[PDB]
Amino acid sequence: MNILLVSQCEKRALSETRRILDQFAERRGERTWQTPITQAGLDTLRRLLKKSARRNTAVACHWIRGRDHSELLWIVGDASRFNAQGAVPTNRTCDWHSAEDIRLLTVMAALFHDIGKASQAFQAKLRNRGKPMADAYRHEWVSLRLFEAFVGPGSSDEDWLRRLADKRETGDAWLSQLARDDRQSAPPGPFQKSRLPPLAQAVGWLIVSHHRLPNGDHASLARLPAPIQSQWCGARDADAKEKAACWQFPHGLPFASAHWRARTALCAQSMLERPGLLARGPALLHDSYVMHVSRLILMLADHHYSSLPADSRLGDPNFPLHANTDRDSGKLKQRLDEHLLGVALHSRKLAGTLPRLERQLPRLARHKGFTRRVEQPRFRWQDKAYDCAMACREQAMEHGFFGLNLASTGCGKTLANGRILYALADPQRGARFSIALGLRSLTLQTGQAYRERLGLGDDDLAILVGGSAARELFEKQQERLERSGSESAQELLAENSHVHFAGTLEDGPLREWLGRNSAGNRLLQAPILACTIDHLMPASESLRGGHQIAPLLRLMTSDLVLDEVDDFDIDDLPALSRLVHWAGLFGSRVLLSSATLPPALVQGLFEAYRSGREIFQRHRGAPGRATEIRCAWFDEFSSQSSAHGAVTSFSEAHATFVAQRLAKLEQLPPRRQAQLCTVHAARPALCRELAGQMNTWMADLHRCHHTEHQGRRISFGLLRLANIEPLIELAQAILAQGAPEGLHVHLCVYHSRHPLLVRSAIERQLDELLKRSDDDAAALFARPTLAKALQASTERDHLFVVLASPVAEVGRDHDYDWAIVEPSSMRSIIQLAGRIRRHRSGFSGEANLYLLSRNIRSLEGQNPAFQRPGFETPDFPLDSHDLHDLLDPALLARIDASPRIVEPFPLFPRSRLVDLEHRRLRALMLADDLGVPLWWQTPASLSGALQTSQPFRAGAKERCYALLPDEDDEERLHFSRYEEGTWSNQDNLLRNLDLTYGPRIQTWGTVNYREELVAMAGREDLDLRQCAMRYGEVRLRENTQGWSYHPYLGFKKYN
């Protein structure tokens, strides 16, 4: 093709644009290039231009499609310099309604945020190079107490402001008015009654929660922030001397410094000048949006300035106090006045920067794969969904969005979600959205699959690999961070987590605070992000640390997709509801993408989103807009859309759409038939019996369903087990049992306990071998991996079996011929049914799905039997654990989303499985007979009480392990353990496992750890040990005895 490159770059961007384009093209004018090129070369040039692109970069590429018709191919950089057709102007000449209030509050809280570091105890601890001694009181608490002292009890919201606005004021007698929690009589909390005016209370909450949320104990929630007490924020049991030491100020608070007092007076006068500012006091205090945006700015500014080197250009040069000491040497680094002034300056700069984030951040525009119409009648709902989203674009932008992608599995919902959220965007600017998969850990294979399905490169889509990590270093690293005096120096995001992005990171708007190659900067600069919901949960469920900044900025600057959102455990639902509420709070548009969404969960999530959107509309946009959420419904058959301002009309619309979808679902031909199997009731015997039965069962299923070509019969099957240790035991039992009779069996073990690179390799092989279609035998038998395995043996019959944990239900597009499934929950049954013959058409009528009568946890005699995963609890018990009673027999004829989408009536919550699931979901999410709505009905967002009462991913405390090669010898591998930024050595906890092979049974779809490790290290151009520590983690529960490891079976717990 012939392309024409035109550059509108300026200043430093022009030099780099010339340097890059002079190598790919010939000049035609002063800023015009032109060359013949190929598609691959054009993509290479575009990616090179996008990698090193500043804010001034502006390059347009034209193309000649049809005579007298040029076509703009793409624009790299600032797209405002060209019109839609790519022309240039002949001459250029010269909505936040609460930005100023947030800026003033943030600056004032920054000035008063570390005023408690003037304590003699804190100064001594900073200067104490010897053995560290834990401070009795947290510096935030004494800062708040000093604010209370300065403001004076009962003082009006104007008196203290005017007093601080008087520069000619050095009345340190206000220190005598201070209280002391160390002193007896239990002084009242600074928030109770009238100890603080309604505004100083807001500033005090900002001060006291600039390192951690005031999580305490215990109507109390609705009265926040009043019930905050000294015991709520830190505090330790110490002798009276230590407690008293935190209150004496020998060198005086930073009030004598001229610059500090001048800036404080300037801020106070600016606040007083503001019309009506001192009137919204109670409104601002309880406003989640204002408080949380102010706290984000304050915390990010503090995190940035706590790492900067000492500056003698601001603050008293010979001030006696100090704020922190450099961790490298321990010498004092920053004076308290300089620290406070810098934190305030950066707070003001960030408050100014934030409104520009909707135009300064990279976006994805002009994509044709999202607008191109389809040619096959199968994928013709992806166009109805796109048209429905485009019909709503303007109303969605004006009022909000709550979409529901209820299309059945195998229909290609990822491209549909991408197209919907791209349609909702303004065509001139582009789209920015996140894909939050409902998985515990995202492998690189799933991210690459997302890139392939959406047709996006790594210059447009980033992947946040790995999973979120619960606080482990909270005891060790926090000690050093507090000793150095900079407790806000921990990274905004975790350490092992890596963002796989290769796009514009040069001149990002938030480069100054986030960094340049830091994982927060890549997380924010990526137009489209592929992460997990556990990565975005720290936005709303972060109690101690700055983990809430990057997810929150992503939420404010992007849309949201919740893939497989119902896969979350029932106990983790309130966290998801909070996340949806905050997504609606900061202006994001949420699209739920699941095929088995029950009505109760959808209603609760919609209520959360509407509640958040009301407060967002109260702060951003034209005032007076009515909260009419533009709800939309998408499915494989049609797409609707309507506005709803209450959960009363949205429920009716959802019920109508569900009824229509069920009516259209009934007429579908059957492609899956389920048969109940009764099993004969420790591990080495039960697993052996199961392996004995699953020989005849697999033989019967293969005989019923298979593929025939040249007299050779191959069939792909799946066996899903609830837990991993029983899965490994059953794998051993099958392996040391052999083929049933002349039926050569290839087994693949796939669970979540393998090394992440190993797991990704297994997924890569299974996603390439299990892609099927109608009448594909000729290509199926010609596939290399299949070819070698078939030719090696002489048996005409082959059984390619996959033994998988519940990790194979999400993100796996596999077409099996048959499946043997243990019962955990109806959603699992539906998802695994949606995978046997999911790509092929034509059913023989014979049973292809086999369900065991009872799960392993019931054979062992444990009660409740449906738990982890499951819904059965002692509070909601089941009268039976046999599938012959919990399931309606009419369901086995045709299994689809119908039992899950609709709510049966009357509810029998102790005899039917789906009835139990619906009863629990409607009991927790809505109400029925510590409620979720308290997150937005009461000011509970001001404390971490809800996050502790209803925790997320609670229970097991996993530890990170890896098979790290020895530093001296690469061949030798060591079982390590991430303890605190340092991989210890734990060879004593690992032992080899011996596997016995029966007649005619080998293993397929496996990988060697060493070969995969070296291959991925070479691919990523990283050190081999660094690659092992970055992408080879395994999370295992702490066991005293240890584990037994085999490459084909993963780590099995040993006792």
């Binding site: 007298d68 405002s80 019109n83 022309a87 001459n91 250029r92 119409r373 048209d387």
Partner: protein, 312 residues
């Protein structure tokens, strides 16, 4: 000096801009929030302008426009008429130049034959005979459309066109001619939807459609109207002297002239752009390319000349 009006390639659809004269140049201004951008309009190569929603023009700019014979029309945004006078709609309010003095032969022929109803139905039949021929030509006997993904069922198109011609030959009056035109347009829509594997297409009226095909058809109607108005003004014939669409549409000669190319070049390109995921600008440029390559303006001029000559 400017190009001959029949040899001009550009056509401009403008929105949310301010058309004015800046330093002797006709330019339109778009507000970029903190800046105003001035974009030049090549008046010496533009047949006509179309000012959509949120546009405005000044007397100086309109004077320089009506000095190179550039027509100006006030259309409506999103494929919507200017307004809807009860049961009828007007799409473009044309501002034809009046200082330019146009040829005075075709106008005399038109006014001479126009006031006889039989001689005006003869003209409508001759107008439809060229529309059918050009439909046949473009859809079948030209390769450019086929090489871009248009694969029409030759037999079905042939039988449809033959039936339309047979109905035309036995047309008693204007109403049956209009009914036959509507039937042919609907069958052509179905055939074009099938040819580009577009799926199931149902034509929406008054710009109420949501699928790309309906929007692109409604947009391309404006380009057809602009070219037809240019041709009628160039020949000196007033817009009001219609032969077919004079019963319900003001300035019906524009619609009658535009019908010649509406179903032969706009229709395939609408579906081709829809299948390709094109935006409105890309579809507009593709349609302009199709019209310039096929010399649609010259065809309109020659057809008007032939009808006027055969009228005598």
């Amino acid at each position: 000096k400017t190009i001959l009006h029949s040899k001009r390639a550009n056509l401009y659809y403008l929105q949310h801009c301010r058309v004015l004269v800046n330093g002797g140049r006709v330019e339109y201004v778009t507000d970029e929030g903190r800046h105003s951008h001035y974009w030049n309009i090549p008046i010496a190569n533009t047949t006509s302008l179309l000012l959509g929603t949120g546009t405005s023009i000044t007397q100086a700019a309109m004077r320089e426009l009506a000095r190179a014979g550039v027509l100006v029309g006030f259309c409506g945004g999103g494929g919507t008429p200017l307004f809807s006078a009860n049961e009828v709609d007007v799409e473009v309010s044309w501002l034809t130049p009046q200082s330019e003095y146009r040829p005075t032969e075709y106008l005399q022929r038109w006014v001479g034959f126009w006031f006889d109803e039989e001689k005006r139905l003869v003209a409508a039949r001759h107008f439809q005979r060229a529309r059918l021929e050009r439909i046949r030509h473009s859809w079948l006997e030209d390769r450019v459309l086929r090489d871009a993904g248009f694969a029409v069922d030759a037999t079905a198109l042939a039988v449809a066109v033959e039936d339309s011609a047979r109905a035309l030959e036995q047309a008693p009056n204007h109403e049956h001619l209009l009914t036959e035109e509507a039937r042919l347009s609907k069958r052509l829509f179905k055939l074009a939807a099938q040819a580009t594997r577009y799926g199931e297409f149902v034509r929406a009226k008054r710009g109420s459609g949501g699928d790309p095909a309906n929007r692109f058809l409604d947009h391309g109607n404006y380009l057809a109207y602009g070219l037809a108005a240019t041709a009628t003004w160039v020949l000196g014939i007033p817009h009001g002297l219609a032969v077919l669409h004079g019963k319900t549409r003001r300035g019906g000669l524009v619609f009658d002239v535009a019908d010649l190319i509406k179903d032969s070049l706009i229709l395939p390109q609408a579906f081709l752009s829809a299948m390709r995921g094109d935006e409105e600008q890309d579809f507009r440029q593709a349609c302009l390319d199709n019209l310039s390559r096929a010399q649609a303006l010259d065809f309109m001029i020659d057809t008007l000349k032939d009808v006027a000559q055969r009228s005598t």
